[PDB]
Amino acid sequence: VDISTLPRVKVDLVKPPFVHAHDQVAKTGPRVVEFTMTIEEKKLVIDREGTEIHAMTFNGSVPGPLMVVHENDYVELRLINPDTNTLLHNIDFHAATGALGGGALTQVNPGEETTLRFKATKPGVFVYHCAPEGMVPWHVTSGMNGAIMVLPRDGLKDEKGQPLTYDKIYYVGEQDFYVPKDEAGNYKKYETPGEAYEDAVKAMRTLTPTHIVFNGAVGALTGDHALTAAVGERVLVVHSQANRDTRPHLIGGHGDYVWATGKFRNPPDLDQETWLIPGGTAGAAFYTFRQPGVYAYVNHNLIEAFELGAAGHFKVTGEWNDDLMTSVVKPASM
Amino acid sequence: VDISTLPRVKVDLVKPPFVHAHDQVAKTGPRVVEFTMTIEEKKLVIDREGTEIHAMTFNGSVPGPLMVVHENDYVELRLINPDTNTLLHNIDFHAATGALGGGALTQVNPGEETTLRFKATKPGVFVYHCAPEGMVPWHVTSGMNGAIMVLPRDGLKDEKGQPLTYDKIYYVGEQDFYVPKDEAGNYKKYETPGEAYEDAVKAMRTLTPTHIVFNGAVGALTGDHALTAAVGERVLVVHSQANRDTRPHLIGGHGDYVWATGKFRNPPDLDQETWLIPGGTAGAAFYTFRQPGVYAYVNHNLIEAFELGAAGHFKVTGEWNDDLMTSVVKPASM
Amino acid sequence: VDISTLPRVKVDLVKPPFVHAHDQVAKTGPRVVEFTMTIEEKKLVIDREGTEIHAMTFNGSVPGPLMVVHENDYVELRLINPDTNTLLHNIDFHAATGALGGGALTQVNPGEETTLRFKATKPGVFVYHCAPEGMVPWHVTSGMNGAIMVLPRDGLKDEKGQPLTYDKIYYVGEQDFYVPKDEAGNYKKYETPGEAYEDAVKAMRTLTPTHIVFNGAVGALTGDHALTAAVGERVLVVHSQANRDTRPHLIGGHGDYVWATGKFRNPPDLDQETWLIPGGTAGAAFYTFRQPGVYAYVNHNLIEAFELGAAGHFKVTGEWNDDLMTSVVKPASM
Ligand SMILES: O=N[O-]
Ligand SMILES: O=N[O-]
Ligand SMILES: O=N[O-]
Ligand SMILES: O=N[O-]
Ligand SMILES: O=N[O-]
Ligand SMILES: O=N[O-]
Ligand SMILES: O=N[O-]
Ligand SMILES: O=N[O-]
Ligand SMILES: O=N[O-]
Ligand SMILES: O=N[O-]
Ligand SMILES: O=N[O-]
Ligand SMILES: O=N[O-]
Ligand SMILES: O=N[O-]
Ligand SMILES: O=N[O-]
Ligand SMILES: O=N[O-]
Ligand SMILES: O=N[O-]
Ligand SMILES: O=N[O-]
Ligand SMILES: O=N[O-]
Ligand SMILES: [Cu+2]
Ligand SMILES: [Cu+2]
Ligand SMILES: [Cu+2]
Ligand SMILES: [Cu+2]
Ligand SMILES: [Cu+2]
Ligand SMILES: [Cu+2]
Fold this sequence. Notes:
Chains A, B, C: GO terms for molecular function: copper ion binding; nitrite reductase (NO-forming) activity. The structure is a homotrimer of 334-residue chains. With 334 residues, chain A is mostly beta strands. Chain A folds into 2 domains: 1-152, Immunoglobulin-like, CATH 2.60.40.420; 153-319, Cupredoxins -  blue copper proteins (Immunoglobulin-like), CATH 2.60.40. The first copy, chain A, has helices at 136-140, 193-205, 302-306; strands at residues 8-10, 32-45, 52-58, 66-70, 74-81, 92-93, 112-119, 124-129, 145-151, 156-157, 163-164, 168-177, 211-214, 227-230, 234-241, 248-251, 255-259, 269-272, 281-288, 293-299, 311-317, 325-333. Chain A has a 6-stranded mixed sheet, with no helix packed on it. In chain A, a hairpin with a 6-residue loop joins β2 (32-45) and β3 (52-58). The longest helix of chain A is centred in the middle third of the chain and has 13 residues, at 193-205. The N and C termini of chain A lie far apart (80 Å). Chains in contact: A-B, A-C, B-C. The interface between A and B is large, with 66 and 47 residues. β7 of chain B pairs antiparallel with β22 of chain C. The structure holds nitrite ion (18 copies) and copper (II) ion (CU) (6 copies).
């Protein structure tokens, strides 16, 4: 019995965009890291207009929470589908090896639970998502996806092999929704999931999202829920998109070090303006803030950002650097 | 006369997803590698519903067959357009240099043939496709595309310069089709290619495929035609998309080493969950299987995969590794 | 006063695809490089059919001109919005740090000007674009975007750290337009920008461009305005797309060295057939021509290229190399 001799540590997850506490450099040997998530089907208002969908969530949020482990830890997930839900669900970890990432082993009807263990053999950020046979994109595009970060045991490294240490981390999950439209263009609503299914499929088959949002709704990462930092702070932004390409961009900043396809054995790309995270991937960008003020963090299809919802904000405190940027002559009459 | 002094070797092509026999490390000096392909316009049923299109093929298949040579070999292609076809065709090799990849030199009316030679000066997997002036996307999106692999003379190498040797290779060609739709959404059929052309153009201009398939049809790489491997086997999957981006993903596995844009002088990306193959590119992923069972291989726009057709299967034999993954508690009642 | 002690140099911009004169290796220490651009709202015919839009331009062109500086120069832009325009405009440089890339500091009503300075701290090609709060994608997709190249002080380097020196440089700006369509599919025209705004938003929300063009119009980089080179010449092609992914490809050639996401501290990708430039990015490809004749340079979604406009030409002079490619048997009767 190898695994029974290992330490167990129980993690208590937090709601995105926050991330549960962890240590970048592993302070122990390999562990069995225990997580519990409870599936919740719930109504969610996703825009300023009040559009309401039936979301399918891990742990009550879109995205599901970020799990964090180290390479060669074991992830042990207790997945609970309470009897107050209506549908069968499961979970596929892109971090895992075998059984469709776990999906073949985790099919839970309402009123059931299961516990899956897998060894996190590859370092990176990875998508996880529900994937019930025959209804995969419906569950994913109903919000039933999140991410897991598998840190190298010795933490992150730059392109030269020197340490990169973040002061803060955020998890931005980006969700494409396909709210069914009638022939005048208004959303339709449905009375049961079975009654909704064919028009969900029809809406998905357009390949044209109605909404593309961060943290589950238009504007979710703004106002009192803007992301925060201070000048000089090193920030890692993990970004996932389980179904569709995105192109993140920090307006007024950069990705100083970017793993666009999320896998830490590779050297990061330096000095990115914008990067492509393919659908079905998590990526990660590291930035050291150099200026205070408001930033926007967007998918840089600017229609997707500013019309469909894929935009959030940072509020950054600290001192303005006029060497880096200044208004020499403020806007005024010619 | 340099080239006439070189060995000639005739290759007999095989139908995708299989690949003609070759040697990873070159066992001879440079050669003139002789290929023959016969263009075939044919009706193809592309989905479970019986939707039938007029496909334009190299060698009778969608995709066309994978050609394999080594760097600095010469590729000599005899391209035959029999008089039983109706259209002019040609061929552009992305591996080649000059004359629009060969397209300017290979225009063949029905009843004609031609022979093109080019030097394969750059190692990688590359798209080839038909490209007749003024009707390029129509031919490509009618299936008239494949790929060529130009191996380094000393075979594949990892990011550290150590050998990577595959045990098996498969070629997955992914095809976006644009079957014209009437205003209720049913497909239209046509009586001649000229009568079809304007509505093909209209359908293409939507930028929304009706079908996205592997090996020419929904489900083609499933059932008795699933891809196969054994635990411990090293597999190279070449994947091409001549017209539109894709994002391959092995469900339950990874791309251990990935040349997402297909060019072997570059170090591979390690440990990919998903990778972006741009339209107009071939990529290649190397994986060593670690678990038995069924895998799905998909474009990870899961709508494209599970609703539009971009999904195939592996059946993998061998021993299950409970250290890598296990069900600790099988699904059961709370 | 550090900056007032630096040399000032005034640059006179040129119209794309040409690029103002500069030195690859910096011949001076850091400078304040002075640019002036005058915003022009103007009617533009964008296709062969005569479709006319109201373009929003920097300096009268779509794209705006390419600015060129070196790392750690200061860019000082005088941005003029004459009173003959109707709208508020600004500028965001992806090369810059702070204040939304400058956009927060550069809001100019008609009849106003402003001068912004920023330090070009990161080497690469970068997008710049207008971004007025609440109307960002409308301005960008009306053509109000260009690029800036920040060269390393010691010029470009290959993957091994050896110099790469271009003989010629071109700037291809690729623009997605969303011309509003009525229910039969014809374009609509508008009488004022305010009257156009809602249907511009509706057209953009389809995520389906009506036109995708190089240098502002279908065919702009063809005929007397084809790009030119000679066999043996080293050419850098800078390519930007401020809003939507593209996949450039030189038909009959390659990208010998490609910074697909545009940032020169990273080693280039070698031997690319096609590469993905994410929306919101500039990329750069270096190629040494080896064959004469006509080439096409395209977005390799071939529908986007040949039906929607994303195609230009090179005319290359010099000697044909039959070792690289030859017609062994010209097209003729079977
Ligand atoms: O609801 N804001 O447009
Ligand atoms: O510990 N090897 O998967
Ligand atoms: O926080 N150490 O770099
Ligand atoms: O276009 N993204 O899948
Ligand atoms: O960088 N603003 O799109
Ligand atoms: O996975 N490389 O970012
Ligand atoms: O024909 N299967 O849905
Ligand atoms: O053999 N040089 O192309
Ligand atoms: O098959 N040799 O690794
Ligand atoms: O969206 N692919 O061309
Ligand atoms: O990994 N299943 O999409
Ligand atoms: O072409 N690099 O995969
Ligand atoms: O106007 N040319 O199709
Ligand atoms: O010169 N440091 O931004
Ligand atoms: O132009 N010097 O390579
Ligand atoms: O599909 N490009 O944003
Ligand atoms: O390479 N011609 O698409
Ligand atoms: O930004 N790397 O091309
Ligand atoms: Cu589910
Ligand atoms: Cu998946
Ligand atoms: Cu053809
Ligand atoms: Cu091509
Ligand atoms: Cu503007
Ligand atoms: Cu921007």
